[PDB]
């Protein structure tokens, strides 16, 4: 299988630099042109750079020209992207993408074929911080069904995971995508709908894991 | 810079349906147009290249057509693997992408169940009040949520997020959070979220009175 595996993603402070790499296998890397493409949260897909098979020609998007440099080490099947003077708008998933491979050289213009799964770069001045976990308590405020949940607030960086009752409660659970607050910290909610008759008797605990801060929180949610 | 414009932005369909998506280039790109399939959390996959040539792994229910500025992707009989977002890409001059067309599962209208959650006493001790409004298991996706504080419509102090379409029941769920300082929260009594949706005969309001 043609495989592209990106690495190097993480948190970078604004103005600083970061190098991404992409390990290729399953094809003759030294014979293929290669691209970087990104997707910034809330924006569309955006081409970033191309490099010729031998590293001669290189081209860049206007939005990164003068700041990003692409290179490759064919002897190690690796593609690099050196990013400098990073800004919040460079926060994105970065994908390594192979230029279209045509052994017959049929066509006049070239696109892309195989994509890696991407690595995430977060450009931010925020410091690692574990979440506060607050109950979303069930009350009278839907017949036989009640909703409850936990609000997972003010953590950095992503991600957090949430389970209910140590994995015993999965039906009816919705864990929402996090939002980025104006503070630079993330917030998300996880909810579950349950029988309203169970509210007095069944214990509901949300289990919150935030690996970057080594935080684990179990919160019992009561009516 | 060549701009690629796809239509529609979202399309709801059922298994077996014939589906057509269009892509327009801002200037002529000859046949240098590709189509990619992308599913949530997964890398794009090339389906069609040189405007109309299927890649060998792609089932022949897919086809592409067009040259110049107008292109189409057609699925003759939609199958469950095909629910995804589709992107066009020109490769005539650099590489630019359309905004994507989401092909989602059609189902019957389902009104949301609406729930409001007051801020917890724990959070109020810290000086902030988050009020959460949940819209559970609704279809279609189009829903409007308005926050009202003593009937005053709120602007600029809420954030929303939505789940992906549920694999089992094809519904969506949505969470909206109103965030106020503790001081602002204690100036008002009635906190309400008002929801409008195709499944609701009139707007649904869930509310509470602070301190009750």
């Amino acid at each position: 299988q043609v495989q592209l595996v990106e690495s190097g993603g993480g948190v970078v402070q604004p103005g600083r630099s970061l190098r991404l790499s992409c390990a290729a296998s399953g094809f003759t890397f030294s014979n293929s042109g290669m691209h970087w493409v990104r997707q910034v949260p809330g924006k569309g897909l955006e081409w970033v750079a191309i490099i010729w098979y031998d590293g001669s020609n290189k081209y860049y998007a206007d939005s990164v020209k003068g700041r990003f440099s692409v290179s490759r080490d064919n002897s190690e099947n690796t593609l690099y992207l050196q990013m400098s003077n990073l800004r919040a708008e460079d926060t994105a998933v970065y994908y390594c993408v192979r230029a279209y491979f045509d052994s017959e050289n049929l066509y006049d213009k070239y696109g892309m074929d195989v994509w890696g799964q991407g690595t995430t770069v977060t450009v931010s001045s925020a410091s690692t911080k574990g979440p506060s976990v607050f109950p979303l308590a069930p009350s009278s405020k839907s017949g036989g069904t009640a909703a409850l949940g936990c609000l997972v607030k003010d953590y950095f960086p992503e991600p957090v995971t949430v389970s209910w009752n140590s994995g015993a409660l999965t039906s009816g659970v919705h864990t929402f995508p996090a939002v980025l607050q104006s503070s630079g910290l993330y917030s998300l909610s996880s909810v579950v709908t349950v029988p309203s008759s169970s509210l007095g008797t069944q214990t509901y605990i949300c289990n919150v894991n935030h690996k970057p801060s080594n935080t684990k929180v179990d919160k019992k949610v009561e009516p | 810079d060549i701009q690629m414009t796809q239509s529609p932005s979202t399309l709801s369909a059922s298994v077996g349906d014939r589906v057509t998506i269009t892509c327009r280039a801002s200037q002529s790109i000859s046949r240098w147009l590709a189509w990619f399939q992308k599913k949530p959390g997964k890398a794009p996959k090339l389906l069609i290249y040189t405007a109309s040539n299927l890649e060998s792994g792609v089932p022949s229910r897919f086809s592409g057509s067009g040259s110049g500025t107008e292109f189409t992707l057609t699925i003759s009989s939609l199958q469950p693997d095909d629910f995804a977002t589709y992107y066009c890409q020109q490769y005539y001059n650099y590489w630019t992408f359309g905004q994507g067309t989401k092909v989602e599962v059609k189902r019957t209208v389902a009104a949301p169940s609406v729930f409001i959650f007051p801020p917890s006493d724990e959070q109020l001790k810290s000086g902030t009040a988050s009020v959460v409004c949940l819209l559970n298991n609704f279809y279609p996706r189009e829903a409007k949520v308005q926050w009202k504080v003593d009937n005053a419509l709120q602007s600029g102090n809420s954030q929303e997020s939505v789940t992906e379409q549920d694999s089992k029941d094809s519904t969506y769920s949505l969470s909206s959070t109103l965030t106020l300082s503790k001081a602002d929260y204690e100036k008002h009594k009635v906190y309400a979220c008002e929801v409008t949706h195709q499944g609701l005969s009139s707007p649904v309001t869930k509310s509470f009175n602070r301190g009750e």
Binding site: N105, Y110 | W32
Partner: peptide, 8 residues
Amino acid sequence: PDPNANPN
């Protein structure tokens, strides 16, 4: 100087 030329 065609960036879309054959890069392989």
